[PDB]
Amino acid sequence: TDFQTYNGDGFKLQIPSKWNPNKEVEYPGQVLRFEDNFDATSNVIVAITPTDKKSITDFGSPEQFLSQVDYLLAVAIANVLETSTAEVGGKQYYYLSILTRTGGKHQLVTATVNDGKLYICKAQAGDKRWFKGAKKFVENTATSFSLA
């Protein structure tokens, strides 16, 4: 109920039901941007770019991957808090949770590689929307990202 299933070009994810699309492009390869109408710092994007890589693991570790796409994050401090990996349909997924400072922004990145394309999903919220009951709008959103 709190989320709506979004079917995109070769992917799917859960998007907070009250968020609205924004056509303004902020990221290279951006194909999706949804945000809280009342606070644009709460948002999710999906970006698709060409890659010669065959798996997200080709980048190295999750942290090594993030270093190579640091355009995703003026940010003065970026702390990787936790990482994870998963495998679905023979495809590897990387997950990172990040706190950035120029309070801070709470960001979650999901990434995978398929069919000559790099897929990145990033969701974020500021302190005002980082509280018990609202974290799912960042966390479920980003971790729900799947190839389809």
- Contacts with ligand GLC by CB under 6 A lie at 16, 18-19, 36, 42, 129, 133-134, 137
Q: Which is nearer to ligand GLC, 119 or 137 (CB)?
A: 137
> Long-range CB contacts (< 8 A, 24+ apart) of 58-63?
58/113, 62/94, 62/95, 62/96, 63/96
Q: What is the DSSP letter of 18?
A: T
> Smallest distance from the beta carbon of 57 to ligand GLC, in angstroms?
33
> Smallest distance from the beta carbon of 7 to ligand GLC, in angstroms?
20
The encoded tokens of residue 84 equal: 């994870």
Q: Which is nearer to ligand GLC, 40 or 81 (CB)?
A: 40
Helix, strand or coil, per DSSP, at residue 128: helix
> Smallest distance from the beta carbon of 95 to ligand GLC, in angstroms?
21
